[PDB]
């Protein structure tokens, strides 16, 4: 073997130029697609909030049009999924993870139009779903589509182009090129065996989609939190505790998402009409809350800067938290096309702030600023539920640019992944794939 | 399939023993990195004090500068050549071998050799980084605990070795994230699955990073301040800069390998001609560490300066070439030390220079040479050692200019792409490939 290794070392990092250039076209397509999606969502939320003015007088007619609009768009979303692409439901990350394992098809000719327009409906309707889901899956499929269109043969190409499309998909969702690469090499990739995924190829794709993102989203961060304070060493233990909390809650939150997945399957028993209508109800519920309590509906990005600043009261945070735990579950578990990734950032932030507030009054000598805990917790839920800490820590960093909080951030996210491991929790994306992969057998 | 399902449901379940031991490892590595770092600083200090007492009479102090660096350098080469040949050079290629189960981890030898050995070369003012010493001392620390607690299994051997290495990188640059990315992008077995627990590496990194912070807080390794931003119509320039780093990467590799051979002749492997050669190169570095500091030393000192545009174009070219020479002499000479940090310095300087030229060619871009400096800082690490992701993240963690992320990624990627298309190879792999082959031959 020592003789083979030598042969391999001398041959390391030599990715077929075809794969590299195709990683470029993919990244570019994924980025343009993420922009389009992002724009469509924004346009719909616009139209909807534009309707709530033509009826801002008759309050009852208003709470009605808010609901109907969100319901009609949500239903349209659930429909497209249930009718033309069942796989394009929920996140899509699990699904793409399956494809990397060669255990799930990448029906791009179906998913692309379904996941795009479908999410446009659910996200554009104000539902508690992130863009990650739609973009990472659209990304992967974009990667497959190019593979098929150029008949690029050979494992490496199939796995690499799929993995880049996924990374580019994540990158363009949060404007985080590094998180997109780390996501692939820590979570998306086959977790138990070697793989022929070219990191350098993923990079190119990410870069390309990130540039596409920048070409249309210049000068306006997704989350501007400003420069928070620093974190003294004698303050670190507090972030461990916060990690321990995210850690015991991570698994629990997973049980709920999986449980709620079942519990909600009953309401329609898989019936496309009871589903579409159930989703239409959940959708309408979100558009409603998106006017009587916005912080409980929508993606959640908006409330992050606010919570980090310490502008919410302890009471409002608990309200927002619980309410979002409910709206996230209802939207994601219901199988609506959308991610649960961003929603978790919001939950993490809120929880983190709340922890911080308490920390502040308990330790004035620490000169704390609840916001450092908000940031520390922002990716902690992604650490305890998804179990992809490195990707979370790096994602938060790329979005909140407060690198001096790196230790606290690592300590919280690590505390989370440690407590989520020691309380029986499982990588939520794996658990979902493990279910879909089982339901693909069980029925035989 | 049914297998996978069984695995998914069992994913991320690392034996609590491994995790707790990763913590002790990290803590030890960090405490070690601190001790090493302090020793180097103390020696460079003493050397400084010796010149003040013999300040008058230039030729006298130019002599004591040389001797002191020579005497410490020889002491360094000796300890390596005599008690641990493997603890020479970087140590990273070596540790990479161990992760492959292709090289031993003689910690009872390497720890004291690499530590006190590097103390001599680094403390003497040579052009070598701390990464080499710390990453290797790290892995060995990781092996030492595995052995002392008779922990059994692959996972534990690979994990504790991997974490000790990451913690080793982390405590060298105060970059926990680089430490982790290095292992999962460069260090780890590059062609087959491995039982390395990321979560365990994390804990170790954190623990050594905290150890670092308990002794170095309030003083960044590299303070460059907040640089300007980078317009999109400015990105192509970073591609070009990456293309340059990419053609120079392989070339710089050939020189390091070639200079390894060319220098082997001077002593033919003879411990005495080696120790004396090293004693010469060492003395040469402590001499330059008084008649042209920017050509000797680790190079960290000139990064902030060069990024600020405080060097003239001429001074940069001088510094560059001079450093290309001193880096090669110190590293290729097999002295215990890293070539990692020195490459940061070269990347910087080269970057600045590119910048300055960019500034005058495009006033409409309102460029600031320093953004190219930072883009290049990890670009050599990207063209030579081919670990871009770790480079980009390392620069970020040290320069804290995240708005330069696209430029940085574009330069580093341009580098790894051109280094690939010009036949270059991962310098750490090429070195291991040499070692591994020179063994079965």
């Amino acid at each position: 073997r020592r003789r083979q290794l030598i042969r391999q070392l001398l041959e390391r990092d030599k990715t077929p130029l075809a794969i590299l250039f195709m990683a470029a076209v993919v990244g570019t397509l994924v980025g343009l697609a993420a922009v389009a999606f992002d724009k469509g969502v924004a346009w719909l939320q616009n139209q909807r909030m534009g309707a709530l003015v033509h009826t801002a007088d008759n309050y009852p007619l208003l709470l009605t049009v808010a609901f109907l609009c969100s319901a009609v768009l949500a239903m349209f979303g659930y429909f497209l999924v249930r009718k033309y692409a069942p796989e394009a439901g929920g996140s899509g990350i699990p699904e793409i993870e399956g494809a990397l394992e060669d255990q799930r098809p990448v029906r791009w000719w179906r998913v692309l139009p379904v996941k795009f327009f479908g999410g446009l409906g659910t996200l554009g309707g104000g539902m508690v779903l992130g863009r990650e889901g739609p973009t990472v899956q659209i990304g992967g499929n974009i990667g497959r589509m190019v593979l098929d269109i150029f008949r690029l043969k050979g494992d490496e190409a199939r796995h690499t182009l799929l993995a880049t499309g996924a990374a580019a998909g994540l990158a363009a969702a949060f404007n985080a090129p590094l998180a997109g690469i780390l996501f692939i090499i820590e979570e998306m990739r086959p977790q138990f065996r070697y793989t022929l995924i070219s990191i350098k190829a993923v990079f190119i794709g990410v870069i390309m989609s990130t540039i596409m993102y920048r070409i249309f989203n210049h000068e306006v961060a997704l989350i501007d939190v400003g420069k928070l304070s620093d974190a003294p060493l004698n303050t670190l233990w507090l972030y461990l505790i916060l990690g321990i909390i995210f850690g015991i809650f991570g698994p629990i939150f997973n049980k709920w998402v999986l449980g709620m997945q079942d519990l909600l399957h009953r309401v329609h028993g898989g019936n496309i009409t009871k589903w579409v209508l159930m989703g239409g109800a959940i959708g309408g519920l979100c558009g409603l809350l998106g006017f009587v309590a916005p912080a409980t509906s929508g993606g959640g990005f908006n409330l992050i800067p606010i919570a980090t600043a310490g502008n919410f009261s302890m009471g409002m945070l608990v309200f927002i938290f619980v309410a979002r735990v409910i709206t996230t579950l209802l939207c994601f578990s219901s199988g609506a096309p959308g991610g649960i990734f961003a929603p978790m950032l919001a939950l993490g932030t809120v929880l983190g702030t709340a922890f911080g507030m308490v920390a502040v009054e308990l330790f004035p000598q620490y000169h704390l600023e609840a916001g450092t805990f908000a940031i520390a917790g922002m990716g902690a839920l992604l650490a305890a539920s998804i179990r992809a800490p490195l990707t979370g820590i790096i994602l938060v960093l790329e979005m909140t640019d407060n690198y001096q909080l790196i230790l606290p951030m690592i300590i919280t996210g690590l505390g989370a992944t440690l407590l989520a491991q020691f309380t029986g929790g499982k990588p939520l994306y794996s658990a979902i794939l493990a279910r879909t992969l089982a339901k693909q057998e069980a029925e035989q | 399939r049914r297998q996978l399902i069984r695995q998914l449901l069992e994913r991320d379940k690392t034996p609590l023993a491994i995790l707790f031991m990763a913590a002790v490892v990290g803590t030890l590595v960090g405490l070690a990195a601190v001790a090493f770092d302090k020793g180097v600083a103390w020696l460079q200090n003493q050397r400084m004090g010796a010149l003040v007492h013999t300040a008058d009479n230039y030729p006298l102090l130019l002599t004591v500068a040389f001797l002191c660096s020579a005497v410490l350098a020889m002491f360094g080469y000796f300890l390596v050549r005599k008690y641990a040949p493997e603890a020479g050079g970087s140590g990273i290629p070596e540790i990479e071998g161990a992760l492959e189960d292709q090289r031993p981890v003689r910690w009872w030898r390497v720890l004291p050799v690499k530590f006190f050995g590097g103390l001599g070369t680094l403390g003497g003012g040579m052009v070598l980084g701390r990464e080499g010493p710390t990453v290797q001392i790290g892995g060995n620390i990781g092996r030492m605990v595995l052995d002392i607690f008779r922990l059994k299994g692959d996972e534990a051997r690979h994990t504790l070795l991997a974490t000790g290495a990451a913690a080793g990188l982390a405590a060298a640059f105060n970059a926990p994230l680089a430490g982790i990315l290095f292992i999962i992008e460069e260090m780890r077995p590059q062609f087959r699955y491995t039982l390395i627990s990321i979560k365990a590496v994390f804990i170790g990194v954190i623990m050594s990073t905290i150890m670092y912070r308990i002794f170095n807080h309030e003083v960044a390794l590299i303070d460059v301040g907040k640089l300007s931003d980078a317009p999109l119509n400015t990105l192509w320039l970073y591609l070009i800069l990456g293309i340059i780093f990419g053609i120079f990467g392989p070339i710089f590799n050939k020189w390091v390998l070639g200079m390894q051979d060319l220098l082997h002749r001077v002593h033919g492997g003879n411990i005495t001609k080696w120790v004396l050669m090293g004693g010469a190169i060492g003395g040469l570095c402590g001499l330059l560490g008084f008649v042209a500091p920017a050509t000797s030393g680790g190079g960290f000192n000139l990064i902030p300066i060069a990024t600020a545009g405080n060097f003239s174009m001429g001074m940069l070219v001088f510094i560059f070439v001079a450093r290309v020479i001193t880096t090669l002499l110190c590293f290729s000479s097999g002295a215990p030390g890293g070539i990692f940090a020195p490459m940061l310095a070269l990347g910087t300087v080269l970057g600045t220079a590119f910048g300055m030229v960019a500034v005058e060619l495009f006033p409409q871009y309102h460029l600031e040479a320093g953004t190219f400096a930072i883009a290049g800082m990890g670009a050599l690490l990207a063209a030579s050692i081919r670990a871009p992701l770790t480079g980009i993240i390392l620069v970020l963690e040290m320069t804290d200019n995240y708005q330069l992320i696209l430029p940085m990624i574009i330069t580093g990627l341009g580098a790894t792409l051109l280094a690939q298309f010009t036949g270059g190879k991962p310098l750490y792999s090429a070195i291991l490939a040499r070692t591994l082959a020179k063994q079965e031959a």
Partner: antibody
Framework: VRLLESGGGLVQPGGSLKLSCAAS????????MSWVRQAPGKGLKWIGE????????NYTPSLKDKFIISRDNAKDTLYLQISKVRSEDTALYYC??????????????WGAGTTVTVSS | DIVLTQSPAIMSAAPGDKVTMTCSAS?????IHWYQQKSGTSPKRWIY???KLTSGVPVRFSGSGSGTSYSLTINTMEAEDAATYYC?????????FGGGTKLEILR
């Protein structure tokens, strides 16, 4: 780094005065500012502190509104209003930038201080 | 709030001499700081986190202690060492100061 506090002087009992502290030589923000005072021939005593964004302002255990520490980062100036001034308030007042090593904060840099005399 | 009591309230020691002053706390404290105050000038952070010297403080100066007893020490106290030293804690809020110790040049 310089801290120049002014405003001190003679104040009639029951009166109120506003002490000022002009900061220069560093980014006034990022820093928690604090007032401390030293009564003639006696020890130091913390008055209170104010974080960078004025979101937090703590005072030594004392009369509800006896002290009002405010700051204007736009003028890089710290302020200390004292009310219902009594002899106990006669003292040298120091503004001090706050910082820390391991995390147990200290009074990083102090100014020369302004003397306050409470008398009729 | 924590009461810091500095042992010798006043002490005299000739130049070149091991001088040691105590700072006892009513309760438990950690990483106390020390400030030097020369007649007519503002207090100066001398020693912090129990034993770290502030940049510029001669090495003859050292400090140590723990729990409820700390001390600042001068190995060979120079002339420009005459001053009042105040210990301060903030391991507990609100921070408190010692009554101070006046170091005078015995002659």
């Amino acid at each position: 780094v310089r801290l120049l506090e002014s405003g001190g002087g003679l104040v009639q009992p029951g009166g109120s005065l506003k002490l000022s502290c002009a900061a220069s030589g560093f980014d006034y923000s990022r820093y928690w500012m604090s007032w401390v005072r030293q009564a003639p021939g006696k020890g130091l005593k913390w008055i209170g502190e104010i974080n960078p964004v004025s979101s937090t302002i703590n005072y030594t255990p004392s009369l509800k509104d006896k002290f009002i520490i405010s700051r204007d980062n736009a003028k890089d100036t710290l302020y200390l209003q004292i009310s219902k001034v009594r002899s106990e308030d006669t003292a040298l007042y120091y503004c001090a930038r706050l910082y820390y090593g391991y995390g147990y904060w200290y009074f990083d840099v102090w100014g020369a201080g302004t003397t306050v005399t409470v008398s009729s | 709030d924590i009461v810091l009591t500095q042992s010798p309230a006043i002490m005299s020691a000739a130049p070149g001499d091991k001088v040691t002053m105590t700072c006892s706390a009513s309760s438990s404290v950690s990483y106390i700081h020390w400030y030097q105050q020369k007649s007519g000038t503002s207090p100066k952070r001398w020693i912090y986190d129990t034993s770290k010297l502030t940049s510029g403080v001669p090495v003859r100066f050292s400090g140590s202690g723990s729990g409820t007893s700390y001390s600042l020490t001068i190995n060979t106290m120079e002339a420009e060492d005459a001053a009042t030293y105040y210990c301060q804690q903030w391991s507990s809020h609100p921070q408190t100061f010692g009554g101070g110790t006046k170091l005078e040049i015995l002659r």
